[PDB]
Structures are given as structure tokens and as C-alpha cells.
Design a protein around this ligand. Sequence first.
Ligand SMILES: Cc1cn([C@H]2C[C@H](OP(=O)(O)O)[C@@H](COP(=O)(O)O)O2)c(=O)[nH]c1=O
Ligand SMILES: Cc1cn([C@H]2C[C@H](O)[C@@H](COP(=O)(O)O)O2)c(=O)[nH]c1=O
Ligand SMILES: Cc1cn([C@H]2C[C@H](O)[C@@H](COP(=O)(O)O)O2)c(=O)[nH]c1=O
Length: 557
Amino acid sequence: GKALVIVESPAKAKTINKYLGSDYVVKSSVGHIRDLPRGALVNRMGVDPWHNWEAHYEVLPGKEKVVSELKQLAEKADHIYLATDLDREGEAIAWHLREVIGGDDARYSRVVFNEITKNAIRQAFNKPGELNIDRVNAQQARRFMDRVVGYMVSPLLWKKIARGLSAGRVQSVAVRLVVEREREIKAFVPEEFWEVDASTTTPSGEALALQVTHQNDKPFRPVNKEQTQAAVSLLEKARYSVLEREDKPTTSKPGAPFITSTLQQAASTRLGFGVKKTMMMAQRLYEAGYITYMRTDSTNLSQDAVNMVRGYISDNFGKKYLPESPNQYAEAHEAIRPSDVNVMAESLKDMEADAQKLYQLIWRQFVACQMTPAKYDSTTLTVGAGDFRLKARGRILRFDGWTKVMPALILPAVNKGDALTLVELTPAQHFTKPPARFSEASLVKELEKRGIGRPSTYASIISTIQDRGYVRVENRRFYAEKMGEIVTDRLEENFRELMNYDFTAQMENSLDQVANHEAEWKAVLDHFFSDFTQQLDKAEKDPEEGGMRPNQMVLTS
Ligand SMILES: Cc1cn([C@H]2C[C@H](OP(=O)(O)O)[C@@H](COP(=O)(O)O)O2)c(=O)[nH]c1=O
Ligand SMILES: Cc1cn([C@H]2C[C@H](O)[C@@H](COP(=O)(O)O)O2)c(=O)[nH]c1=O
Ligand SMILES: Cc1cn([C@H]2C[C@H](O)[C@@H](COP(=O)(O)O)O2)c(=O)[nH]c1=O
């Protein structure tokens, strides 16, 4: 008569089983159990846009075994707990388990937790919740419209452009961003601008480096060899002196604990990890109960989490690193942080080196976020030389603050009015450089920025656009393929709304309204499908009627 606890993976089962008494029987479904696959089109999609979005879910291959294994486990249990992940997909999976197993809805509870620890599991089963149909509807809505775009747009692409090509509701918009970035880079015309550095000696022979900033009180920006040399000869004869000294106490505050998007960026910048790699390892860490749920865009930290880390900072770093009050970064979810701050990367049980480095990265950002600011004494020397003004910036670390948890890593003395002796002038030619190429994690950042992605879809978006001749990662950077641009233009021309960034961001909002009972999923899908078929209908017409242009290059005749 024990309770049945269902999770989606063996790894998560093992971890949660350590925190559930013998009264519970943990069992992983190891997969989605059930899911989707002119009536022909409807059957292929498994969803019917014409019959009020009636769906057709069938158990995945070899899962009928898992199904028949769960039912009998349920008949021996007084209650079934669906402990799927906390996001919508997880809710949907919980729904699929409750549907497939059957029985009284009262026999089912929906436990929510953002980390698999003793206390988090206790709090989750002490106040078990109900399955939220709206989050399930929100998830299915997303899924249904992705199926519609993919299965209804792709065919048009095969007929008009080339067979084998794919279309993705959000994938096509992600690609568009890369394609626009590609075109920016292709059209960019580098511009030449000069800079002039001056080496000088303070009264007491100390070396001081300055860069000219003003000439005639106007920004010094020579654009060629002659203008620079002309400025150089004026500068070689000028008398140098410190027009003014400015000593200001500055500080650098630690960043907020990680959320999905920032974790990916930092893992990509500091560890060279790609999005797929970071998310796969994040999941590994989360499922082993080492970090909080890795799909979040909430920077909140629970009081226990904050008090725990503050205890760590206090014992391991000291009073000077402990802020008076806990840092508050601005839902109900939490940031990606380690579950136990006292567990070090080196102490993780079965995690490969890279998974340890990701944890370490998460741990440090977490601890640092709750530490005091670093203090520096910033100095700004402004030097006058004839009609020129030169600058020298520098700072010395007074207190490392939060930087103490990061790996271990000089303007001379001079008073206002002191004369500087010129030693050498160094003119340097530079050129404005084209916009940086998106990186996997950098594209996500842009996606988030535009409210296009979502914690649990960012990674899927990145991968899903990568193996379809549209865009490719070369040296950890995105490059737009010819087909990518060809398709992106076709879609921009005949599926404007679908390709529009705001509308795409708005759809994410529309999905949030469904998840929050502020909109009905079918009506939302109806509206999406309405705008969609209208776009699609004109796209299918001959180009002479405003239809999509075939990817052809007609000869002279
Ligand atoms: C997570 C992490 C941060 N940091 C420091 C480097 C950055 O400071 P500087 O910009 O002053 O170099 C800052 C970046 O934080 P984020 O990774 O959150 O962006 O935190 C490390 O040195 N190593 C790490 O592994
Ligand atoms: C799994 C999944 C989750 N989510 C999200 C967004 C929110 O963080 C959370 C849903 O929670 P909410 O119902 O309380 O809004 O999960 C998506 O937007 N798409 C998905 O596919
Ligand atoms: C080209 C290159 C990028 N990167 C990174 C850092 C960032 O995570 C990402 C690109 O982001 P950025 O445009 O903000 O620099 O890829 C490396 O770590 N090494 C490299 O050699």
C-alpha cells in the first residue's frame, strides 16, 4: 500500500530515492512514454487544426512495456506522485503518465521541486500539489503550432525551393537573426582611424603612458596618415603637464547567480562549452542532486540558499566579504546554483571533468553573488600639451571582495601642475571592425533579449537550426549558409508575421497567458492557425500572384 513516485529518468530516480522513505516506490518512466507521430497531413502531425486541435498521441516504441509496468505498480499504490521536472514539458509529461496509467484523478499528485535534496524533496511531498492543466495546455499549444509550421511550411519549401528543407516556427526566426548578422558582416566597410600614445616621464623620472583624447577640445580622431603625422609633430614640441588629477573610489559588484541563458554564455566564454554541452552537463548535475533546476530565467535565491552560502562566505572568507544584508537580484523559481554550497566541484561523485568545471563555474558565480563588492582606487590623469589633452587611467585593488572566489589574476605619483617630459609618441592605425558573429550561447542571449526563446527551448533552438543547411557553427561561431539566406528571404516575404521578431516574442507571451489561465489554448491556437493559413495560402500561389518565389534563375528566354 506504498506510494508510487514517478520521474523521467533512472539518474533522477536514484537521487530522489535517497530522500524518500520506504513508504515510497520510485520508478522512472525513462522517456516521454507517449507523444505525437487532408487527413494525411493530420495523421502525420497527430494534431488536427480543423477539428478543434484534436490530438492523436501514441506510446513511443518499446514503451508499451514501461506502460504495462507502471499500471501494475499503480494498482499496488495508494497514491501516485508525478515528480517530473518543474517546467511545462515536465507538466505535460506528468499529464501523459496520468493519462496512460488512468484511474481516479484524486490518486494523482504533482510534486514540484527545483533541486533534488533531502529538504527540497521533503517540502515537495509535505505539500503535494495538483496537476496544472493550463501549463499542460501551454506546452501542448507550443508543440501543436511547431508541428503546424514544420509540417505545413516544409512542403511548400520542397515545392518552391528544394526538397528535404525544414521550417521551424522559432527556428526560422533564430536563423533570420544569424542571416541578418551575416549580411551585416558581409556589407561592413572597415574604416581607418588613428590613435596616438605618448610615453612621458614624471618629475621624478617615473614612466607615464598617455593616449591623446582631445585636440582643440574636440575628440582626437585622425582618419589617415597625414592627419596623424601633423598631430604628431605638434605633439612632439608641446610642453606637457598634469592639467588635473582625479582619485575616485570605485567598486565592482558580482553578477547575479546564473539563469539558463547566462549560464550558457559564461560556460561558452569561460570554458569553451557549447550550448548542447552545457545543458547536457547541467541536467546531469541537476539530476544527481548537485544543482538547482537548469531551466530558469529567475535570479531569485531561497532564504536557506542565501543563509547557507553566507555561512560559507563567513567561515571561508570572513566578515569583510559578508555584505551587511543578503544581495537581492530581480516569479517563484530559482537561479541555477549548487544545492549544497559546501560540496566542492572536486568532490562530485560521478561527474566527468567538464561537468565538474561547469559546477565550479556555477558555484563560484553563486558564492560571489553573495559577497561584498571589490573596491578599487581609480585614478584619472588628464594631461595638457599645447592644444591637446591626454589621458591616463589606472586603478589599484583596495579590497578584492567577490573576486576572492575567482582564480588569482600602475599610474606613477604625480600632482596637478607637474611637468611631464615627452619620451616618445606612438601613432597607431586601427580599423573599425564588423559586428561579432553570433556564438551558440551568444545567439541565445540575443534570443532572450528579444523575448524569443525560453529556458527550456534555447538549447533545442540552437541545435535544431544547425543541421539543416541554413546556418553552421565554425570555430564556435555561426555562419549563415546560402540556403539559409535563400529560405530566410522566402519566409520573410510570404510569412512576414511568422518571421517577425515581435510577433514571435508575443507568441511566447500568448503561451504564458495560457499557462496562467489568461487565455484558452485552443482559441490561441485558432488565432495562430488563422494568421498562419492566411500566410500559407498566398505563399502557395504563383509568384505572379504574390506567392513564394521559386529558387530558380531563369535564363535570357
Ligand atoms: C563564473 C566565473 C566568473 N569569473 C569572473 C570573471 C569576470 O570578471 P571580469 O569581467 O572582471 O573578468 C566575471 C564574469 O562573471 P560572469 O561569468 O557571470 O559573467 O566573474 C571568473 O574569473 N571565473 C569564473 O569561472
Ligand atoms: C518546458 C517548457 C517550459 N517553459 C517554461 C517558462 C516558465 O519558466 C515555466 C512555466 O511556468 P509557469 O506556468 O509558472 O509560467 O516553464 C516554456 O516556456 N516552454 C517549455 O517548453
Ligand atoms: C571565437 C571564440 C569565442 N568564444 C566565445 C565566448 C562567448 O561565450 C561566445 C561569443 O560571445 P560574445 O560575442 O559575447 O563574445 O563564444 C570563446 O570562448 N573562444 C573563441 O575562440
